[PDB]
Amino acid sequence: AGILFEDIFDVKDIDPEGKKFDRVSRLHCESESFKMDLILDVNIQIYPVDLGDKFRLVIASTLYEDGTLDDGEYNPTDDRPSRADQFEYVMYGKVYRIEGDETSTEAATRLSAYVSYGGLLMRLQGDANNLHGFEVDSRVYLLMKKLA
Amino acid sequence: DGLAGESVEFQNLATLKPSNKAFEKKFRFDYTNERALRRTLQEDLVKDVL
Amino acid sequence: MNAPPAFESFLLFEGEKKITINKDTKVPNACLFTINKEDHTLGNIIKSQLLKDPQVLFAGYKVPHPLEHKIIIRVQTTPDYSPQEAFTNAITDLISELSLLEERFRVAIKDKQEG
Amino acid sequence: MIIPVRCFTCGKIVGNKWEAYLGLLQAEYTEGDALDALGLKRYCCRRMLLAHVDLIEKLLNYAP
Amino acid sequence: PYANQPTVRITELTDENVKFIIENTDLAVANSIRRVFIAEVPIIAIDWVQIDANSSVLHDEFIAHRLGLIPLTSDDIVDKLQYSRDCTCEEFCPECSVEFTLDVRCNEDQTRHVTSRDLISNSPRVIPVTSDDILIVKLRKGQELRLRAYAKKGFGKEHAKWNPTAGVAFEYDPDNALRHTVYPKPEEWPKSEYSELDEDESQAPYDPNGKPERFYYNVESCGSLRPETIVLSALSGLKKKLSDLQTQLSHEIQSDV
Ligand SMILES: [Zn+2]
Numbered sequence: 093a094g095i096l097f098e099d100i101f102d103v104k105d106i107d108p109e110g111k112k113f114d115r116v117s118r119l120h121c122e123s124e125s126f127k128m129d130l131i132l133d134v135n136i137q138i139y140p141v142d143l144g145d146k147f148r149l150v151i152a153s154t155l156y157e158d159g160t161l162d163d164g165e166y167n168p169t170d171d172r173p174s175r176a177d178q179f180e181y182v183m184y185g186k187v188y189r190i191e192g193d194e195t196s197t198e199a200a201t202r203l204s205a206y207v208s209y210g211g212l213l214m215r216l217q218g219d220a221n222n223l224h225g226f227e228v229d230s231r232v233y234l235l236m237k238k239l240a
Numbered sequence: 241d242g243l244a245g246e247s248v249e250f251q252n253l254a255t256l257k258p259s260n261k262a263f264e265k266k267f268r269f270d271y272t273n274e275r276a277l278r279r280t281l282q283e284d285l286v287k288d289v290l
Numbered sequence: 291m292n293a294p295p296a297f298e299s300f301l302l303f304e305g306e307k308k309i310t311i312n313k314d315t316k317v318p319n320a321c322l323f324t325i326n327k328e329d330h331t332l333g334n335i336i337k338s339q340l341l342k343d344p345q346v347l348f349a350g351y352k353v354p355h356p357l358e359h360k361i362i363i364r365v366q367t368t369p370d371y372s373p374q375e376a377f378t379n380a381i382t383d384l385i386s387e388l389s390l391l392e393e394r395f396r397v398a399i400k401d402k403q404e405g
Numbered sequence: 406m407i408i409p410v411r412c413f414t415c416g417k418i419v420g421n422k423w424e425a426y427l428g429l430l431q432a433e434y435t436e437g438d439a440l441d442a443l444g445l446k447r448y449c450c451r452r453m454l455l456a457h458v459d460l461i462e463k464l465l466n467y468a469p
Numbered sequence: 470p471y472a473n474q475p476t477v478r479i480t481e482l483t484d485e486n487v488k489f490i491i492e493n494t495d496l497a498v499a500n501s502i503r504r505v506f507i508a509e510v511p512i513i514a515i516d517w518v519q520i521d522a523n524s525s526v527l528h529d530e531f532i533a534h535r536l537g538l539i540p541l542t543s544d545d546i547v548d549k550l551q552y553s554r555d556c557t558c559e560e561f562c563p564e565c566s567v568e569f570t571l572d573v574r575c576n577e578d579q580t581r582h583v584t585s586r587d588l589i590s591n592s593p594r595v596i597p598v599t600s601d602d603i604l605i606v607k608l609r610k611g612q613e614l615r616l617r618a619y620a621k622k623g624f625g626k627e628h629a630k631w632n633p634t635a636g637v638a639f640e641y642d643p644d645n646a647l648r649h650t651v652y653p654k655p656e657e658w659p660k661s662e663y664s665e666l667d668e669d670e671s672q673a674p675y676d677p678n679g680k681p682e683r684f685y686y687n688v689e690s691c692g693s694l695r696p697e698t699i700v701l702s703a704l705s706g707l708k709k710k711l712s713d714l715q716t717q718l719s720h721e722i723q724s725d726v
């Protein structure tokens with residue numbers, strides 16, 4: 093259903109290097125199911141987060157749960173039941189670079205996916221088995237909801 | 241050179257600085273290593289090269 | 291020497307029209323209302339009233355030059371709703387707003403004066 | 406040369422307050438209290454009436 | 470139909486200023502009401518000065534300028550008076566202008582103060598508001614000022630002489646619940662007179678889903694109009710402008726089809 097990545101993350105640290113920007117904070121987070129690692133810049137005025145909070149990332153290529161390409165135009169007058177109803181923080185961005193651990197001979201084994209959400213950047217490191225839907229210059233959505 | 245000054249840019253020559261080992265490593269095409277050449281190229285292309 | 295007369299900021303002399311309609315060919319169902327001899331006073335309220343209308347996708351205004359007296363309001367609406375209808379509805383709603391505010395202000399003034 | 410009719414900034418009438426201000430000053434009122442008693446609250450009008458020079462008084466010394 | 474339902478509460482009402490509050494309104498509507506207060510409320514001011522004799526120390530243009538800025542009472546006659554441009558008369562007439570006459574001659578030893586009280590007007594409803602008086606010019610013995618003026622109807626967009634207000638204090642969201650302005654050091658800033666916080670607090674907590682809803686006004690009248698009449702005329706004038714725009718839009722739509 094277009095769900096490129098799915099996991100629950102723990103906020104291990106917030107702004108380790110300092111409060112770089114007032115309204116945006118950098119979360120250093122670590123999962124436990126797939127044991128990945130997510131640096132993520134989030135807005136704080138509209139959506140505060142605290143250290144040691146559980147939140148679910150459902151990073152997906154489409155909110156319309158049909159596979160139909162959205163094409164990236166703002167359509168506020170849409171009634172179909174998009175995926176942005178069960179999550180309280182939705183973001184849009186471009187996967188602008190995919191790093192890895194490739195040698196000359198061996199294939200990738202630990203991939204990094206870099207996604208820029210209009211300026212708010214995110215790095216997702218993990219095993220290459222999970223980061224296959226990510227492609228360079230691919231437009232993706234990031235979905236977040238905190239867990240009680 | 242024959243070139244107007246309004247269309248030239250600043251560029252870096254990638255051959256002047258590197259040492260002999262690094263230059264040979266990063267500029268000499270290798271074909272003995274089948275795995276790497278297969279990773280970079282397609283199957284038909286590597287077959288033709290070898 | 292070249293100082294314009296002060297009254298040209300709000301007066302139409304023979305040759306110009308207060309409002310004109312120009313379809314925008316870049317996107318479907320969009321209009322460029324060009325209003326002469328107005329300023330931000332009637333631009334801001336129209337934009338704000340259009341922004342409330344859920345069938346209006348885009349609503350902006352600009353003043354191409356502070357020395358030229360002309361505003362350009364761009365409106366793009368849903369396929370099932372004409373931009374001209376959106377403009378007319380916005381003006382009607384603004385007029386209703388102002389009438390209601392005037393009536394309530396008069397009532398409040400009467401109450402304060404009485405006691 | 407003469408007191409402006411209106412404050413340049415806001416447009417409050419201050420042309421009628423120059424003589425009253427001078428009279429208050431002659432009544433051993435400090436400038437701040439004199440300005441306050443005349444209703445000038447915003448500092449633009451206080452600027453207007455405090456910084457004025459009555460040059461017309463000197464211009465009237467010459468015969469017509 | 471998505472028009473608002475604005476509400477008005479009046480806090481203060483004197484002969485000089487009106488302090489009121491508008492609730493449930495767009496920021497744009499409140500701002501446009503303020504701009505109409507300043508610049509689109511018609512009043513009557515001197516705009517045509519003809520000077521017969523002027524022996525004062527002030528040249529003719531200076532006297533004309535200071536005459537134009539004298540506020541004139543425009544309570545009820547401004548509605549019944551037409552603009553000079555739209556009137557059918559040739560140059561000026563009682564239906565579209567008010568005639569003023571000034572005639573002062575100083576022959577006493579002490580200085581004579583040509584004030585606004587010397588502006589004699591044929592129409593009894595239009596007089597200088599000071600009737601201390603506004604000083605027009607000081608005159609030495611032997612100097613005379615004799616002129617006749619005509620006062621038109623106009624609004625502040627043309628000239629500041631037709632501005633009826635004397636500073637429209639407009640405010641909204643006195644505590645930064647909306648964070649429309651970001652204080653680098655909030656503790657240093659004085660609290661607004663409409664604030665609703667105790668001494669310990671510096672600004673209200675951020676409101677992520679808030680919009681400007683309450684607007685505090687203080688319309689101070691120069692004297693030409695009562696402040697309540699300034700606000701009423703402003704609202705009526707904005708309504709009239711919008712209705713005229715609607716009429717022109719209707720004509721254009723009918724012509725395009
Ligand atoms: Zn002032």
Ligand SMILES: [Zn+2]
Pocket residue numbers: 553556557558559560561562563564565566
């Ligand atoms: Zn006439």
